[PDB]
């Protein structure tokens, strides 16, 4: 019509900008200069808008997109209105089935590069040269809830990476913990049904805190290992940038000489590991159910590209049987103290999608998509997965041509004798649709395996045994890995695990199920079991108190790589601070605060009791990002209250509650000058407290001290003190 | 061999039980004796489980449902495992497309009956006989979010009723406000795309608080009336039992003589009208995203059957043009002060479904499904709806045989010459599949229209006009109905409206969009417009301050039926009270509390700082429903604190917070004996406060006071006091 504002302010800057500074936008508009081979290959299907006429799908220009055709301006709508019917038809058919699991997920484009050639252990082309760059598309997800459920639920997270290599798509489809719940794929519908909403009423969404889950767990101790991980703060990551990734299964690397090496895949977050606390996570599902999705997108728009290091645990074929646990058992992890992770390469996620539906929702990842240089093993969970991903994609994406949906296409050549199916895009000119043929001189042709550009040939593993439906006896140990995990956690991590079990079991309506789980905990660790029992009003029996603890794992009592926090890795870049304003802020404080944060790549949001602007002591006009209620402390990592007319907000219950919530969730707080008046709301003593930064002004060491706390993520020593505060 | 406990406590009693007393269960097992003709006819497809062997879908008993078939017990899974593949295949294909809108919804079975014969105004069979009962299935829903999004979002709500009548299915597909946002169906995809998650990043879920919605609103002032309703407390109902329903459009009733009467449909909740407050609603999306779903299912299990009264506004055909708005405009309401709602019948929802997916998810409602005695009008929104419901059901339910899906099936005869289509269940024996035919003597035959059991004939409305895509000039007024609604709300309801607009607009990133919406508000009411602007730090211009208020609606400056609360209608049956226990509770208090609650059908939840049991002063063992943190005050209507060992909980952070939250949210609080020591955390009054019930002991008088407060729902007089409290 001519509907935009004259200043051009409807349009975000096509340049990196902090979160909240500009409206977010399709990736190709936001970052037009950020390219890779896959992103370039999608140009053929990207559709613009500006300066084009509005048409039907058939290209007929529409004159009046405001009205149906009727007989009289108050008359009945006419069936001949093809423009109305095409328009409503498309709308009526917008939806496709969501993924059966991991329906909720958020995705981005990036690139991967190896640090050195891995030719000695694998002929995989994408790992053959440090100068070889592989486009990726990554989706992170929750597990149980639908595509419209909340982000910060307690759940395992999915971490799936599509590598568009020169010799084929390799999908690495992993999670954020190094084991899974179950051993054999045949049980996946039972486990998933147990954790998903219960079938009579479809409650609860996004939660394992209900009877059927804990019933199944109580009857299937193989689940306890991943359940320990889920109940720990691992189940509630601060963001996808701050969690680990794992392939879980042992796979094989195959080199040019035909040697097989056992491998488990790791992703290490270069930003470090960090999680929420449960009360914060749960509240955040209400205040911002899109928190992780938003955080991912805005990090990328800001330039805080999520980076991950790919690492391999490598085990020689001759060492297959050298551990207390079976390598093929996906409920067991391989302790880094026994087998180190060797760094392999770096993955950087640097561009958001243009259209979430077209790129994210239709993306299809499947762990059967491997490339020469890789192979499978007989892990019975993996073995069944290979069937499932292909099968489910045929309904979810509407037939067997899902690889022609643009996000899914290989960047490399694909030719074969497959034809037809729904939505077929490729128009084949081969005279032949079969081989062997003479009529096209047998093209396209098979290719023998070889060191590079060769055909896929399976590693010739020996198979010997009878056709059985039987769990290997080597898989029948359930408690030592849970115990190993438990003992590796810090005291505050352990408390969080106790609290997770305690909260979940309290939602289980049938008391005998709670009892049964507590009994299982008593096989893992008596201290764990006692603390959970106490929280449930349950008394362990003398028999339970006497259950002997499970054996160590190959002589390991603990392994600190299993803790989120035991070995600090605190990166502050990309984190965010709430600044609580008043109507006459000390402009000197604000210059110091904002500049110090910017120097470390830490973002800020200026909050007030209303939107608009406030004016500082010296006339500086300050734009307000959000209100105290609008952007609660849940959404930030720390809080700073500069000096000024504090009486303006000391009376504001919202401002006080802001600090009390941030205090309760162990976040750093800094109070400059008269802001120290807020000490009383949070019961801070005159002399002070570790984790509260206070000075006459925001000058000197004030910002370094606050940033030091932010590097340590949360203020764990504050835990005994929070029990009392009413928040 | 993993079995149930001794007590038979795995199983809920098949009798009415209060919420939390038993695990919930499928409706036919909870209430086996609750029947109606539809519930009975679903028996052909009900599938039991007890004492049956586990099988494949082909009926083959399975020996080992724990393992895949493999070559050796650590070997690869074999392709010949048909039991694994069937099981995984069915799992892989569980999902179907969710509804394009109203994807989130909760449904129940019930029955309808008219108070008297309406044969003088309509020949509809289901309204012909006060002793004739019609089975219903009802689905309530939100609009924007996916099937896994939260219940207590701010949204219009859907209220769809399927009447299984003797002369056909009639679907009355309404919402919880008497108007819609737009005038012509052609704009529906525009409006819906604007309110749905934005297409680049698919944020936000379940919220209109984002740029695209307020952009659309600001450019399409026809939306302002329903937006006013959405921003009021109507947008966050307490329960589906405590909101109104409306068909929105003018339809027709046709009697046996051929006379048309214009009609608008109403549902009146016999439990009264009640809504949440925003902070409570948003927090509840995090603590219990299934709150409404749960509340509906639990009410039904408890015998608090949702009841609604069907009501008609009736306008003679000769009065079509007699209002200062067009009857065919779905953005305009008909004020009850102009045309009263005539009572028509009662609907009672008295059984939950057996399987949520089978019966709720697959139900298909469509406002085109009418019956003889009803007809349409040229309302241009209704007219395009008629195209859309049939069409979307073809992809969502997999084909044209959706009426054969058990929940959708008529209970009355259906016979015609249609054949085939995916998943065809009916096996037709008619030698003929066309008419006219001689080979089957033309059966099934057309039936002339008439007074009863006749064929459908459209009312022969006169149509006169040219073929035009044009909005009727009579639709081009956008401000008077928003104003009428505004002036009819109480002062606290007006405040909440202002707060809704202010909260939403503050999340709009582009400031000019906020300014344009404030400009529209200035066309409705200057007080409204100024209060929002102030919250947004916007100053109205001189011209804005001089915008003439829109005219009254046919002389009305207010209509109190538009307010939720102006006219008392409170009903406490089915509400719930938190009782905060201590470790030595005064049984005399608890006896008097529970006796009084029980007499009015109010439920209780017993809460403590842990699970298990506490023993009262007289030896009564009290099982604990949930913890202070696990079932927050958000989920209850009022809180009572009995006396006993108060020292036990007086310094508990969660206990204090519980009262501070209930206080903030305007809920009645009752404190007995030493529990009065808690008056200090809610930091106000000592002679007492209207809204806080207090006495040395809990008695007849104490409970009467508390129950009177509960009848008035919330303590509006406390609003001035809550700004200060930090919760
Ligand atoms: C090691 C254990 C497993 C891991 C790490 C894992 C990981 C994942 C991830 C990350 C996704 C989402 C991919 C995306 O973002 O689109 C996914 C989806 C899926 N998973 Fe797995 N999964 C595991 C076990 C299984 C098993 C045993 C089965 C069945 C045999 C299975 C069947 C599926 C299916 C059907 C989907 C949806 C795929 C689609 O619609 O494209 N998963 N899983
Ligand atoms: C008066 C305005 C409207 C009202 C009261 C209304 C009400 C509803 C309700 C209550 C549902 C959910 C039924 C259920 O629970 O399954 C629904 C779904 C739906 N509505 Fe409407 N709606 C309106 C306007 C429109 C318009 C203008 C269109 C399109 C022209 C439309 C298209 C749809 C579609 C496609 C569905 C999904 C139906 C299905 O999948 O079965 N609605 N609507």
């Amino acid at each position: 019509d001519s509907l935009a504002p004259e200043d051009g302010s409807h349009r975000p800057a096509a340049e990196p900008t902090p979160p909240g500074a500009q409206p977010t936008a399709p990736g190709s508009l936001k970052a037009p200069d950020t390219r890779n081979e896959k992103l370039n290959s999608l140009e053929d299907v990207r559709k613009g808008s500006e300066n084009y006429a509005l048409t039907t799908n058939q290209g007929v220009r529409i004159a009046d997109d405001q009205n149906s055709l009727r007989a009289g301006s108050r008359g009945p709508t006419l069936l001949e209105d093809f423009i109305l019917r095409e328009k409503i038809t498309h709308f009526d058919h917008e939806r496709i089935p969501e993924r059966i699991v991991h329906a909720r997920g958020s995705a981005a484009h990036g690139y991967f590069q190896p640090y050195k050639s891995l030719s000695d252990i694998t002929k995989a082309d994408f790992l053959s040269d440090p100068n070889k760059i592989t486009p990726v598309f990554v989706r992170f997800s929750t597990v149980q809830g639908g595509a419209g459920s909340a982000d910060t639920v307690r759940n395992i997270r999915g971490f799936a990476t599509k590598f568009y290599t020169e010799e084929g798509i390799f999908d690495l489809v992993g999670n954020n913990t190094p084991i899974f719940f179950i051993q054999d794929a045949h049980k996946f519908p039972d486990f998933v049904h147990a954790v998903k909403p219960e079938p009579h009423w479809a409650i609860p969404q996004g939660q394992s805190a209900h009877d059927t889950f804990w019933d199944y767990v109580s009857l299937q101790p193989e689940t306890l290992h991943n359940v320990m991980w889920a109940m720990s703060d691992r189940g509630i990551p601060r963001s996808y940038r701050t969690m680990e990734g794992f392939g879980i299964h042992t796979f094989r690397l195959i080199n040019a000489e035909g040697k097989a090496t056992f491998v488990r895949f790791h992703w290490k977050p270069l930003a470090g590991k960090a999680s929420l606390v449960w009360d914060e996570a749960q509240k955040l599902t209400g205040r911002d159910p899109d928190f992780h999705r938003r955080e991912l997108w805005e990090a990328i728009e800001a330039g805080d590209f999520p980076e991950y290091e790919l690492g391999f645990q490598l085990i020689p074929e001759e060492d297959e049987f050298k551990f207390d646990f079976d390598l093929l058992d996906p409920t067991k992890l391989i302790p880094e103290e026994l087998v180190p992770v060797q760094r392999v390469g770096k993955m950087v996620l640097n561009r958001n999608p243009d259209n979430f539906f077209a790129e994210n929702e239709q993306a299809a990842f499947h762990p059967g998509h491997i490339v020469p240089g890789l192979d499978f093993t007989n892990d019975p969970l993996l073995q069944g997965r290979l069937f499932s991903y292909t099968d489910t994609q045929i309904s979810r994406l509407g037939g067997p041509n899902f690889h022609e949906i643009p996000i899914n296409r290989p960047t490399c050549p694909y030719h074969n004798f497959q034809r037809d199916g729904m939505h077929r895009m490729g128009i084949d000119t081969n005279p032949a649709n079969y081989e062997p043929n003479s009529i096209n001189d047998n093209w396209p042709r098979e290719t023998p395996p070889g060191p590079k550009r060769g055909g896929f040939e399976s590693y010739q593993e020996r198979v010997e045994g009878n056709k059985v439906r039987e769990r290997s006896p080597s898989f029948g140990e359930y408690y030592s890995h849970p115990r190993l995990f438990w003992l590796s956690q810090t005291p505050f991590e352990q408390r969080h695990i106790v609290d997770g079990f305690s909260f979940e079991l309290s939602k289980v309506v049938r008391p005998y199920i709670r009892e049964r789980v507590v009994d299982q905990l008593a096989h893992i660790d008596l201290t764990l079991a006692q603390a959970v029992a106490k929280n449930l009003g349950i008394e362990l029996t003398d028999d339970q108190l006497n259950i002997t603890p499970p054996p160590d794992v190959n002589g390991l009592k603990k392994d600190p790589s299993l803790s989120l926090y035991a070995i600090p890795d605190g990166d502050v870049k990309g984190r965010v601070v709430a600044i609580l304003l008043n109507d006459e802020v000390r402009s000197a404080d604000l210059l110091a605060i904002l500049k110090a944060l910017k120097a470390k790549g830490v973002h800020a949001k200026l909050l007030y009791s209303r939107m608009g602007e406030v004016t500082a002591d010296d006339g500086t006009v300050l734009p307000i990002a959000a209100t105290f209620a609008g952007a609660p402390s849940l959404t930030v990592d720390a809080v700073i209250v500069p000096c000024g007319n504090i009486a303006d907000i000391a009376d504001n219950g919202d401002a006080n509650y802001y600090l009390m919530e941030a205090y309760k969730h162990l976040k750093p707080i800094a109070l400059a000058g008269d802001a120290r008046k807020f000490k009383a709301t949070i019961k801070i003593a005159d002399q002070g407290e570790e984790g509260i930064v206070e000075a006459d002004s925001a000058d000197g060491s004030f910002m370094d001290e606050l940033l030091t706390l932010m590097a340590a993520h949360r203020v764990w020593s504050r835990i005994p003190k929070i029990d009392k505060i009413p928040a």
Side-chain angles (χ1 to χ4, degrees), chain A residues 81-401:
Chain A
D81 191 348
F82 64 102
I83 300 169
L84 167 78
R85 277 186 291 93
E86 176 193 84
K87 183 172 175 186
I88 304 300
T89 292
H90 206 274
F91 172 76
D92 281 348
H93 292 295
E94 284 187 7
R95 302 295 173 258
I96 71 176
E98 66 186 13
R99 294 160 176 72
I100 324 289
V101 283
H102 301 255
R104 173 73 188 179
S106 299
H109 293 269
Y111 69 96
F112 165 87
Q113 191 158 13
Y115 297 139
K116 65 161 163 76
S117 175
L118 300 189
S119 279
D120 287 356
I121 60 179
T122 177
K123 56 171 167 183
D125 186 65
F126 80 107
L127 293 176
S128 71
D129 179 352
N131 288 310
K132 201 184 275 286
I133 296 175
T134 296
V136 297
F137 189 67
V138 172
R139 185 165 183 281
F140 299 104
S141 45
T142 59
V143 170
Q144 192 249 60
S149 64
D151 283 336
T152 54
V153 293
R154 182 179 292 288
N155 253 213
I156 298 313
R157 300 306 194 278
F159 191 149
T161 300
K162 184 165 293 298
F163 291 86
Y164 302 92
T165 91
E166 290 178 21
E167 289 183 8
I169 288 310
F170 161 49
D171 291 334
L172 178 44
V173 185
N175 280 345
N176 75 331
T177 68
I179 72 285
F180 198 63
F181 293 98
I182 58 161
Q183 301 181 321
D184 186 311
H186 193 76
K187 296 238 47 116
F188 196 66
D190 296 310
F191 173 76
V192 169
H193 280 191
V195 72
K196 281 251 180 192
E198 303 194 7
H200 52 300
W201 58 355
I203 292 184
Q205 199 69 208
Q207 295 156 67
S208 55
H210 55 108
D211 292 55
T212 59
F213 174 72
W214 288 104
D215 198 35
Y216 186 96
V217 162
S218 78
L219 303 167
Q220 295 281 273
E222 70 195 58
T223 68
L224 295 157
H225 190 195
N226 215 209
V227 165
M228 293 289 298
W229 285 75
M231 298 301 112
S232 77
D233 293 345
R234 291 285 182 154
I236 48 180
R238 154 68 172 88
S239 88
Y240 297 137
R241 303 182 301 99
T242 66
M243 67 190 198
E244 287 182 311
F246 304 89
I248 297 171
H249 315 292
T250 304
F251 289 80
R252 291 171 163 124
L253 307 173
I254 305 292
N255 67 7
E257 310 92 280
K259 182 171 99 148
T261 300
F262 292 121
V263 65
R264 289 204 184 179
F265 302 118
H266 285 251
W267 289 113
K268 169 177 181 164
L270 292 183
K273 303 174 270 163
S275 284
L276 314 168
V277 295
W278 167 247
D279 184 60
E280 167 198 23
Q282 188 176 37
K283 288 180 95 182
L284 212 26
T285 66
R287 297 307 189 179
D288 182 7
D290 312 301
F291 183 69
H292 287 157
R293 185 167 288 175
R294 182 192 312 280
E295 212 259 4
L296 172 61
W297 191 282
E298 296 183 338
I300 293 169
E301 296 207 342
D304 310 319
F305 301 143
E307 312 177 283
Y308 304 86
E309 180 172 273
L310 185 55
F312 292 172
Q313 284 179 301
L314 269 356
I315 297 180
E317 195 174 55
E318 327 77 85
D319 293 357
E320 175 173 2
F321 301 100
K322 298 207 181 147
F323 305 87
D324 285 356
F325 52 92
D326 191 315
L327 295 188
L328 301 188
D329 181 348
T331 66
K332 299 293 179 300
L333 56 77
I334 300 174
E336 292 180 50
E337 288 293 306
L338 306 181
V339 178
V341 169
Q342 295 178 36
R343 322 173 333 129
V344 164
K346 184 164 78 129
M347 177 166 68
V348 182
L349 271 4
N350 62 355
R351 240 214 48 202
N352 291 316
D354 287 309
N355 182 263
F356 184 99
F357 179 88
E359 292 169 85
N360 175 324
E361 182 72 22
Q362 302 187 127
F365 304 84
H366 174 75
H369 293 161
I370 57 166
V371 292
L374 312 167
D375 219 327
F376 304 118
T377 65
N378 297 332
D379 170 322
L381 189 66
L382 172 62
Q383 282 276 313
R385 288 182 73 203
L386 303 182
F387 170 76
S388 173
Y389 293 71
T390 299
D391 176 51
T392 195
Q393 285 154 16
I394 276 356
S395 62
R396 185 167 70 85
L397 296 171
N401 289 312

Side-chain angles (χ1 to χ4, degrees), chain A residues 320-526:
Chain A
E320 175 173 2
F321 301 100
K322 298 207 181 147
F323 305 87
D324 285 356
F325 52 92
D326 191 315
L327 295 188
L328 301 188
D329 181 348
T331 66
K332 299 293 179 300
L333 56 77
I334 300 174
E336 292 180 50
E337 288 293 306
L338 306 181
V339 178
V341 169
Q342 295 178 36
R343 322 173 333 129
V344 164
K346 184 164 78 129
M347 177 166 68
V348 182
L349 271 4
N350 62 355
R351 240 214 48 202
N352 291 316
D354 287 309
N355 182 263
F356 184 99
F357 179 88
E359 292 169 85
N360 175 324
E361 182 72 22
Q362 302 187 127
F365 304 84
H366 174 75
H369 293 161
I370 57 166
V371 292
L374 312 167
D375 219 327
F376 304 118
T377 65
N378 297 332
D379 170 322
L381 189 66
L382 172 62
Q383 282 276 313
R385 288 182 73 203
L386 303 182
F387 170 76
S388 173
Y389 293 71
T390 299
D391 176 51
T392 195
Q393 285 154 16
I394 276 356
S395 62
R396 185 167 70 85
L397 296 171
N401 289 312
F402 57 89
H403 65 279
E404 294 187 322
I405 294 165
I407 192 64
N408 293 324
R409 303 183 305 197
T411 47
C412 66
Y414 111 73
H415 298 86
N416 55 46
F417 298 97
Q418 303 185 27
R419 300 285 181 269
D420 310 351
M422 194 64 82
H423 311 122
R424 177 71 182 183
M425 294 290 290
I427 289 168
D428 288 288
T429 57
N430 192 345
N433 67 176
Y434 60 98
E435 66 81 15
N437 68 78
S438 69
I439 69 171
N440 199 49
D441 210 7
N442 210 29
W443 289 103
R445 301 184 172 171
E446 298 152 286
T447 303
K452 295 201 192 47
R453 300 281 187 278
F456 185 91
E457 193 186 72
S458 285
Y459 177 72
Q460 294 180 38
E461 173 168 31
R462 178 153 195 264
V463 172
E464 182 270 332
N466 284 336
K467 297 194 180 174
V468 289
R469 290 171 168 90
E470 184 184 336
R471 204 68 69 77
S472 168
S474 65
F475 276 47
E477 194 286 322
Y478 305 130
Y479 306 118
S480 91
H481 282 48
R483 172 173 185 79
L484 169 70
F485 177 75
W486 167 256
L487 289 167
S488 306
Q489 295 320 295
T490 68
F492 62 91
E493 288 180 304
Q494 284 184 342
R495 165 155 239 171
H496 291 178
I497 292 172
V498 167
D499 286 346
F501 278 109
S502 303
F503 171 87
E504 293 244 342
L505 293 180
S506 86
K507 296 320 181 100
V508 167
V509 179
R510 297 170 182 78
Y512 76 85
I513 294 177
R514 311 180 197 149
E515 287 165 15
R516 283 171 180 198
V517 178
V518 154
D519 186 61
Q520 290 297 139
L521 296 186
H523 290 75
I524 293 165
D525 182 82
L526 223 223

